[PDB]
């Protein structure tokens, strides 16, 4: 059946604050994209220099 399709566990690659399934998201998502966009912003500042 199509209901036999189950997503495998991704917990080795998974980020730290999204590990437990019993905690809601949208509480630390802003921090995650703030980190990634800070990486992109620092890269853009360096190549602008």
């Amino acid at each position: 059946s199509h209901t036999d399709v189950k997503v495998p566990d991704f917990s080795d690659y998974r980020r730290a604050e999204v590990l437990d399934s019993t905690k809601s998201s949208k509480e630390s998502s802003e921090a995650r994209k703030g980190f990634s966009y800070l990486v992109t912003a620092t890269t853009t500042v360096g190549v602008a220099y």
Partner: protein, 95 residues
């Protein structure tokens, strides 16, 4: 990252394990909370659990008092604090 730090519902062993297990049932058999059901009446005494047939009973029998009246309580009929009148009955069924 990771999990690793364990929740203390699994690493609790021994006296810590039974006090947490009993406390999250709400029962304290190891004298960690002040007990309830104050009644100095004759037909309804103060019930105090025990494991032996003899226990210390202290009576701060009027509020904001210096001295606690200490006396031994034995298995059987309930006798009062020897100056005020608060009854005390021992029940030796708490292991």
């Amino acid at each position: 990252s990771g999990g690793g730090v364990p929740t203390d519902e699994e690493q609790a062993t021994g006296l810590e394990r039974e006090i947490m297990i009993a406390a999250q049932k709400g029962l304290d058999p190891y004298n960690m909370l002040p007990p309830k059901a104050a009644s100095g009446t004759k037909e309804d005494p103060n019930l105090v659990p025990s494991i032996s047939n003899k226990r210390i009973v202290g009576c701060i029998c009027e509020e904001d008092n210096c001295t606690v009246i200490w006396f031994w309580l034995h298995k059987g009929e309930s006798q009062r604090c020897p100056n005020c009148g608060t009854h005390y009955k021992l029940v030796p069924h708490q292991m």
